């Protein structure tokens, strides 16, 4: 679930 | 101009998503780290006339320095002031051990302004303490809030590790070298475009960088506050690359 907040975002399952 | 004062007093904001525009010019360490099609993706901190701090993974895909370009001075995030420096990045150094934070050396130093002004760095391995109020700033998604398009600030408080880490919170995803700050009612936030941007604490005389935006389970959501690279615990990396470099 963990989204990095770059834009656009890095985001993962977990 | 000593570090962490700025010339513009910011604004307060008790009660980025949420939040409110900052006064312009208030934060003079925020950067743009933009394309090269000028689009603004990340923050970053200005720590010394030729050194911008950020979180890695705004730039890890594509290492090369001549993608990046810093722009200081700004406010809005369009049709950018007239006296705005815009920089090239000669350099990128991540950090050794895979935390999510980096350094850009400019390839020329920034002028010094009372627009354009370092933040302090914290004392080494120096730990904010629960509760303390702090501020994020950034250009970054604002999930149907107001001021897209102008630098926005949320004044937030740090949680403690151990309480962040807690099963109805983070549940232990939150390593020592990251802390947490935000409102665990959610509505106030840093989001994506805010990554890399700085958490500053004000003490006694300036603002302190504490923080380097980097994560969170969403943004705003309820028991899910925003995680960011905890920089006291890379000072001495920070300043070894500055010396050496």
């Known amino acids: ?14 | 101009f000593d570090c962490g004062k700025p010339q513009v007093e910011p604004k307060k904001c008790p009660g980025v998503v949420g939040g409110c525009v900052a006064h312009p010019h208030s934060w003079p360490w925020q950067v743009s780290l933009r394309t090269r099609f000028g689009m603004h993706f990340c923050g970053g901190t200005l720590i010394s006339p030729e050194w911008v701090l950020t979180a890695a993974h705004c730039l890890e895909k594509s290492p090369r320095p001549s993608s990046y370009k810093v722009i200081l001075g700004a406010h809005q995030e369009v049709n950018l002031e007239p006296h705005v420096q815009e920089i090239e990045v000669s350099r990128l150094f991540l950090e050794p051990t895979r935390k999510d934070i980096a350094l850009l050396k400019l390839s020329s130093p920034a002028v010094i302004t009372d627009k354009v002004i370092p933040a302090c760095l914290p004392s080494p391995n120096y730990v904010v303490a629960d509760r303390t109020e702090c501020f994020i700033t950034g250009w970054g998604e604002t999930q149907g809030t107001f001021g897209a398009g102008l630098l926005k600030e949320a004044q937030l408080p740090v949680i403690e590790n151990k309480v962040c880490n807690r099963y109805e919170f983070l549940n232990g995803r939150v390593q020592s070298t990251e802390l947490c700050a935000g409102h665990l009612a959610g509505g106030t936030d840093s989001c994506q475009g805010d990554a890399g941007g700085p958490l500053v604490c004000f003490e006694k005389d300036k603002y302190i960088l504490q923080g380097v935006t980097s994560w969170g389970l969403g943004c705003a959501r309820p028991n899910k506050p925003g995680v960011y690279v905890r920089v006291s615990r890379f000072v001495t990396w920070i300043e070894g690359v500055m010396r050496n470099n």
């Open chain 1, 1 to 14: 679930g963990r989204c990095y907040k770059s834009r656009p975002p890095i985001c993962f399952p977990n």
